[PDB]
Design a protein around this nucleic acid. Structure first.
Length: 600
RNA sequence: GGAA
């Protein structure tokens, strides 16, 4: 970590190590030399880590954040992309700097884009997932696709919302003229601008800033024969810009000092829109709209000709009136100054996506889902997409802050290592089972035993270790009970929300594949308790040398593994109440040598 | 060497 958080160099050509390529986390990885703030980063071990820069861009828009997280009160399993983004957004705030992964988001996105002119985005975005790491015009093409899919799903949710259109909606009126006696208009609500192919130059020094480029994209006359004039008469809350220029324009844009205007005032006077720096040069006839830059995504062309995206973010501080600027690499997060955040002089920096937010609207605080009324009906309700020894929970069993539950999950392997670029990427969740941990009549009996549906191709079920047979096909199911993934995730998320305490064997690597982060006070992992330096003790072994159980033979079963993980934690509490915490534990060292940690 |  030789100055890995250094984001500034003595010259303009040497890229700082803060923008360098980060080593992949392969699970025994220290993140303290990469993030000193309470703002989380993203695991680059995904199919396409260029989107990670864009999710971090939207996480810091109060309107974009509070809505997507707000949709978590109601249960909207049909909108796969909006709710998985809400799980991801809520995960980043709860981690307070801890690492986060967007595997569920990219998996829901890859399955959504694989549902194949309404298809122009699918063949383009789906091709980048499989995969000069990133090409040109790809981040902007995903920025258009992400907002177009969220708003399309923003309607199909419960209690239909139009919040994203009141923030991103551009009333784009575009008219085409056949002849001088005929003119036809079309009205389309666009979520983002497109500063693409700007082959028009006027007197510039009146160089200049970005403001004329936004004015051109808001009202321009185009000539294309298969004349045309498109103009927007709306100044929405957040302005999502997608720069698509030429290298001759990008070379001449890094010379104009302070081109990326931090804050500006704009209003609609004529049929077009006017944008000037301060309110003094504004006419003042209409009502003024102050816009501040909320963040942007830049492309970094490394000295080794490596391409990767980073995210710049400004977040307001309600305590004292200032602005904390942040630079988001994959998992490298640094609190940088604004002067360094706006400087475009570096040739290895190319702005890709820029967002502008309303001044008074950016100061709005970020509201978590905990301040809302959440609907926990999925726990007590049986949701089966099919046609069972557990018993569903009753309202007398209302989980509160401190309820004990035993959880054990089973996964499958979709893809191999594919190294030599070295990144084991694919692993899919197949089954979880949560057990009642509270003592009483309904003790040790499960309440949800769901199999996660999966339509993707499976490489190996790992049946000897997962107990999963090829009955995971939705129609042709061996059908323990096949339930979707967005529903079974909500059961785990709500228990963590309420404050339930999870017990089990190896919960850290289970939640990683589940793609959720549960705090320490809610995790009781028997592997960390019955720990002897390295060489984590086997669950079949602890259930033999500490208990009289000959288990984990034939095919594994999460119901059996979670039940024995619950009594093992109960036997741990027995040995802890009396001062025998070491005698039984130090003796299992020596007894394991004579048996070589295996016995029939 | 565990979970898979």
């Amino acid at each position: 970590t030789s100055d890995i958080q250094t984001y500034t160099s003595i010259n303009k050509y040497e890229v700082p190590p803060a923008y360098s390529r980060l080593p992949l986390t392969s699970d025994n990885f220290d993140f303290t030399p990469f993030n000193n703030t309470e703002y989380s980063g993203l695991d680059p071990d995904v199919d396409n880590h260029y989107t990670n820069a864009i999710i971090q861009l939207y996480r810091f828009i109060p309107e974009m954040f509070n809505f997507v997280v707000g949709c978590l009160k109601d249960e909207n399993f049909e909108t796969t992309l909006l709710t998985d983004l809400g799980y991801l957004f809520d995960m980043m705030e709860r981690s307070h700097g801890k690492i986060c992964s967007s595997s569920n988001f990219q998996a829901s996105l890859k399955s959504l884009t694989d549902k194949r002119e309404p298809q122009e985005h699918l063949e383009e975005y789906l091709e980048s997932l499989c995969i000069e790491s990133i090409k040109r015009n790809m981040p902007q093409k995903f920025n258009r696709f992400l907002l177009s899919q969220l708003i399309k799903e923003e309607a199909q949710t419960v209690n239909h919302n139009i919040t994203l259109n009141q923030c991103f909606g551009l009333e784009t009126e575009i008219r085409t003229e056949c002849s001088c006696d005929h003119y036809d208009t079309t009205v389309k609500l666009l979520p983002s601008l497109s500063i693409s192919g700007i082959n028009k130059t006027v007197i510039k020094q009146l160089g200049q800033n970005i403001l004329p480029y936004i004015e051109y994209a808001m009202k321009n006359v185009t000539q294309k024969n298969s004349t045309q004039e498109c103009t927007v008469k709306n100044l929405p809350s957040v302005l999502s810009l997608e720069l698509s220029l030429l290298d001759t324009e990008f070379s001449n844009i890094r010379s104009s000092k302070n081109w990326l205007t931090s804050e500006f005032y704009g209003s609609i006077i004529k049929n077009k829109a006017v944008l000037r720096s301060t309110a003094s040069e504004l006419k003042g006839t209409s009502h003024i709209f102050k816009y501040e830059l909320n963040g942007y995504v830049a492309k970094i062309t490394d000295n080794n000709n490596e391409t990767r995206l980073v995210t710049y973010v400004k977040k307001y501080n309600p305590k004292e009136n200032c602005f904390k600027w942040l630079m988001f690499n994959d998992y490298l997060v640094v609190e940088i100054t604004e002067e360094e955040a706006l400087k475009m002089t570096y040739p290895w920096k190319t702005p890709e996506i820029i967002i502008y937010c309303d001044a008074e609207e950016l100061r709005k605080p970020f509201f978590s889902v905990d301040t809302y009324s959440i609907n926990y009906d999925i726990l007590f309700r049986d949701y089966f997409a099919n046609g069972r020894e557990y018993k569903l929970l009753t309202h007398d069993e209302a989980p509160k802050s401190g309820t004990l539950v035993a959880i054990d999950a089973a996964f499958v392997s979709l893809q191999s290592e594919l190294c030599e670029i070295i990144r084991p990427k694919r692993t899919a969740l197949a089954r979880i089972s949560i057990i009642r941990g509270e003592e009483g009549e309904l003790y040790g009996v499960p309440f949800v035993d769901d199999y996660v549906v999966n339509t993707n191709h499976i490489e190996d079920y790992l049946t000897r270790y997962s107990g999963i047979l090829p009955g995971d096909l939705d129609p042709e199911k061996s059908t323990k009970r096949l339930v979707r993934r967005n529903v079974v995730y909500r059961k785990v998320w709500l228990l963590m929300q309420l404050g339930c305490v999870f017990v089990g064997h190896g919960l850290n690597n289970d939640f990683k594949h589940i793609n959720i982060n549960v705090p320490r006070n809610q995790i009781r992992d028997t592997a960390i308790y019955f720990l002897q330096g390295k060489r984590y003790l086997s669950l079949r072994y602890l259930a033999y040398v500490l208990l009289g159980m000959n288990i984990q033979e034939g095919n594994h079963d999460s119901i059996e593994d979670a039940h024995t993980a619950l009594i093992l934690y109960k036997k741990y509490l027995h040995l802890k109440e009396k001062a025998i915490f070491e005698k039984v534990l130090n003796s299992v060292y020596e007894e394991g040598r004579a048996h070589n940690f295996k016995v029939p």
